[PDB]
């Protein structure tokens, strides 16, 4: 905000794998405070990702995040009456936040039988760079490439 600078809220890591990063992803996927329901969804989806990929849950998850993490984003800024989109380098913490949010929204959209199946499917397609979340990160990189004339 204007003056008060925030100290980050601390997140307790996930039980099954003890990952700070994964616990955040459960939070991104949590709906209506049902963290138990969200925890099962990503725990189920992660283990089918493990079986259908070959690596561990964390390694498979990391691969999908890497293909979805953005590097540069646009922000509508102003000088006079300009309103250009300005490309800015994403800070590392926001890169993971954007990747997790993009994966979750893509997983919700791609209609399957279960959310864990939806999440597992989108997570796999992200690993091979075919997912809608990968599509959105391509659009962001494309959109920030067009407006690279501003800095």
């Amino acid at each position: 905000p204007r003056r008060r600078v925030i100290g980050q809220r601390k997140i307790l890591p996930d039980p099954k794998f003890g990952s700070e990063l994964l616990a955040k992803f459960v939070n991104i996927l949590m709906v209506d405070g049902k963290k138990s329901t969200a925890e099962s969804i990503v725990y189920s989806a992660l283990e089918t990702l493990a079986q259908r990929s070959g690596k561990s849950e964390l390694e498979a998850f990391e691969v999908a995040l890497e293909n979805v993490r953005p590097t540069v984003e646009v922000k509508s800024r102003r000088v006079g009456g300009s309103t250009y989109q300005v490309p800015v380098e994403v800070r590392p913490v926001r890169r993971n936040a954007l990747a997790m949010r993009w994966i979750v929204e893509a997983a919700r959209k791609r209609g399957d039988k279960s959310m864990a199946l939806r999440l597992a499917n989108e997570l796999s397609d992200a690993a091979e760079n075919k997912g809608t979340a990968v599509k959105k990160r391509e659009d962001v990189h494309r959109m920030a490439e067009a407006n690279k004339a501003f800095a």
């Binding site: 300009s82 250009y84 407006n147 690279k148 004339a149 501003f150 800095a151």
Partner: protein, 116 residues
Amino acid sequence: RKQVSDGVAHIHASFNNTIVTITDRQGNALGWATAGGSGFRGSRKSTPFAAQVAAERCADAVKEYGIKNLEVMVKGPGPGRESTIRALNAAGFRITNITDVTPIPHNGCRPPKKRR
């Protein structure tokens, strides 16, 4: 496609667009590129980045002449009067001298009226 080893880089920088022209040291143009020609229509045409892209697009398509040393004659105001030179040096050219050739009258013709 005769070989030229010594070229002149004319940067016509203006508030709306940047024109880069590589000539030999007798004035004959060998190749050219403009910010508005390299994409960058509208507001993106008048940015230093677009001028830098024009310098690259001009360094290439004149590479066939095999120029290695460039005089630089930058003319006019505009965002693309230093980005073009930096891009020219980044393109593998040895800049020999940089000259500002902006036409300055000595109280000659009357300029247009101020915009309101």
